[PDB]
Design a protein around this ligand. Sequence first.
Ligand SMILES: [Ba+2]
Ligand SMILES: [Fe+3]
Ligand SMILES: [Fe+3]
Ligand SMILES: [Zn+2]
Ligand SMILES: [Zn+2]
Ligand SMILES: [Zn+2]
Lengths: 160, 165, 160, 165, 160, 165
Amino acid sequence: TYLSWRKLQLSRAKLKASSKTSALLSGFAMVAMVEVQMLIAFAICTTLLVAVHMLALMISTCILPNPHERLHWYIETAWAFSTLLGLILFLLEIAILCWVKFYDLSRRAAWSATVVLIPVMIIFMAFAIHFYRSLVSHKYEVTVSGIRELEMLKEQMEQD
Amino acid sequence: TYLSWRKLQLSRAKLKASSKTSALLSGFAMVAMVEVQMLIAFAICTTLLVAVHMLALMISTCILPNPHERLHWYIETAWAFSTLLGLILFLLEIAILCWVKFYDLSRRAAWSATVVLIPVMIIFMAFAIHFYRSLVSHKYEVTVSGIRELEMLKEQMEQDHLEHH
Amino acid sequence: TYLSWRKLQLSRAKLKASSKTSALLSGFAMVAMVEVQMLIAFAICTTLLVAVHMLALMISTCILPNPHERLHWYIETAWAFSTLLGLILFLLEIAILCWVKFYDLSRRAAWSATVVLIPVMIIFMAFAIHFYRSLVSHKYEVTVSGIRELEMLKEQMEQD
Amino acid sequence: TYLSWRKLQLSRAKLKASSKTSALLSGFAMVAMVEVQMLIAFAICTTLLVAVHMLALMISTCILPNPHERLHWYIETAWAFSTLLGLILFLLEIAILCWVKFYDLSRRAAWSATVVLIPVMIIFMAFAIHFYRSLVSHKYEVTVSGIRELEMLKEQMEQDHLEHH
Amino acid sequence: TYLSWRKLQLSRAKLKASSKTSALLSGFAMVAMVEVQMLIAFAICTTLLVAVHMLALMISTCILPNPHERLHWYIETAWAFSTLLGLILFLLEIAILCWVKFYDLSRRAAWSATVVLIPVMIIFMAFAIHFYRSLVSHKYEVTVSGIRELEMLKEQMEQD
Amino acid sequence: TYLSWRKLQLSRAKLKASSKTSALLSGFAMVAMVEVQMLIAFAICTTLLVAVHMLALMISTCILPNPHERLHWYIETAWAFSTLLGLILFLLEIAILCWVKFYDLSRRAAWSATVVLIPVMIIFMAFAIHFYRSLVSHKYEVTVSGIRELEMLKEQMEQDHLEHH
Ligand SMILES: [Ba+2]
Ligand SMILES: [Fe+3]
Ligand SMILES: [Fe+3]
Ligand SMILES: [Zn+2]
Ligand SMILES: [Zn+2]
Ligand SMILES: [Zn+2]
């Protein structure tokens, strides 16, 4: 009873927060684009960011009406994946914007920012891979996949 | 008990989230339009986007007061449909905006974006079709459904009034 | 017990959502007006939109402190009516804004938008009528009024 | 039990909504003022609007820690009053803004708007009066009410301390 | 049980509202500053306002993980104090902004606004004093301090 | 029961507030940057601020699905740390902005502000250090902790599968 209650309240706080954040990032970004008016990057990015976020929101239009377990995990993962694509794209978006604001101003600064982004993107790209892998395949293989990737790390910290 | 409780808390988190997002997308889009100030497209889009979202918000003004099941599902579906049209129109809106911001600047970028929208747009249009199909069909079933509930309400006041003497 | 609990949680999610949306639409609209600077329309509209929304919010300042049933339904309906007037006015506002942005630019587009608004406004005007009618009169007459208007529709779909 | 529960959940939804709206109207107004950059009116209004709203927010900083009943109603009423002044000032603010945006443009529009505000303004001023009247009256009753509660708190620490030995 | 439940739900609605408002005031203010571009005042103010608010938010990062009573009241009061400093600073900020918008325009108006602020600031300064006094000292002294300050008022209303 | 309930409602109010604030600070900062359009500082700051906040938001994408205790505390701490870095970077961001807005205008004001930041910055850096220290240490403990939980999950599917025959 406490487990089903916790699961349901987790989908309910995930609904309310996915909604507020996807909507807010999308809106702030649209405004950020109109306010300033590699550019193929800028457009494909803004447009992709809003598209991916709207996808997540719709997945919150449809989880409400809806064995059951496998379908709910595929939908859940599609929502999580769309959302992660949105956070990543919002980061790329601010990179491309430092780029556009500083283009004819200072190249050193722009390049510096876009560069300091790489290590975080790696962690970001890492998870994006897990959610994508989890989407095509079944829980087991990805569960064992995950134990392998973690155990091969357990050997590194000890050596040091 | 847990089922009716979960259903009611789902309509309550759907109310609170439909409201916050419909209002936020609409407001942000209106501001985005005034800030830059194929164009027939831009205007019809902004205006449709705000109209469809206001529709959703009103459906959240009216689900609160509310056999009942069929009527509640139709209203629910009209809400889901208005909302989905809003997400689509918001996406269309950012396309038209890349279009307008980049028009005399770079055609390659704008076109590239507007194109990369297609695979996602398919999924959006797909669902929009299902939600539309559910509405047109039950236009019949529900109107009646609503008559039966309003009648039962006219009847519950007649019984509740027959005891006042 | 479940009924009184559901009624109370409905007034509580209606309070929280009326508040967030009335405030957000009002603020976004005020900003939309200052950012661009038939115009009598534009001013009367912006001003009416903010006034009607503030009305709803105040009705949320006063439902909190407060036979009881009839008074609560009149207040409820006044809140719903103020809110609906706000959604309508927000739509009119975006119409008038396409109008103002495109005036000396393209008349075809502006007129096109303001036109595509009519069928939705009808549905909007329709409900605005119900809430107004519900305000002056008592539940019964409007309940029967509603059964008549719906039954006269039951005859149309069958014929086709 | 249901009554005390409902009262407490009403102060909790009133806290969460007072906060979101007071903060949002204030922020939006400040931005609206800087964006355009009878004028003594414009400044006194913006400044009063933000001040009154910050007042409300602080009253939400202090209802959280809190005989008790009379004190809680006075504080509640000060919150409702600050909030209502904020709604009024926000309305006044958009009037003065139609005024300023349209000043050298069209006087007819600005005046028309500012006029159409009157019937609604009456209802706002009406309630503002009631909330004001409740405050001035109990300035007496409550101060004392608060002394009795703070004393009982000074006394509950003295009893709670008499047992430590 | 009802008391511990109410206390916990009060810290939970205080968390959610401190967060939304501190974040919103800080963001709106940052934007208000960039949009317009005694000035030492303007900068020290904007900067202090954002700093004090971020302080409150962090205190909401750390109340979540955490005899217990005395520590929780010191943290609580530090949060309340940071928050109050934020509301005050937001008011000062709008004063300084009327000041900056009207400087070369109309001095009468600016001075008028900044002046009408004083009586509210007094009430604001008053509470800021209570929360600060409550921070260095223990509950008792400030409780009695508070009974003295209130009783000396009970003598004024009667005389009139 | 009350303890596990309180813990779960604390992660739920922390989820909802981390989300609203991380998203709002990030969006507001991006807009603040485009609106004005030592500068290497300005760019690295804005970009770091948005990156660290997006990190926090994602940690709220993943705490929802989730021995378990140690893993949940590490994830919790990574969230608290990303969030705190965001508050710091937002503060740094408004400093750099006083700097940039006032650069060719008044150096006294900008410098004054940027200086008055120091005592608060200390408290922020202080906590940032503790949260960092907790992470580096348990890099060991947790990885293992997560292996034990994922294994137990691989084992609970093997038992749940041994009964299907
Ligand atoms: Ba501008
Ligand atoms: Fe809630
Ligand atoms: Fe909320
Ligand atoms: Zn009779
Ligand atoms: Zn003693
Ligand atoms: Zn087998």
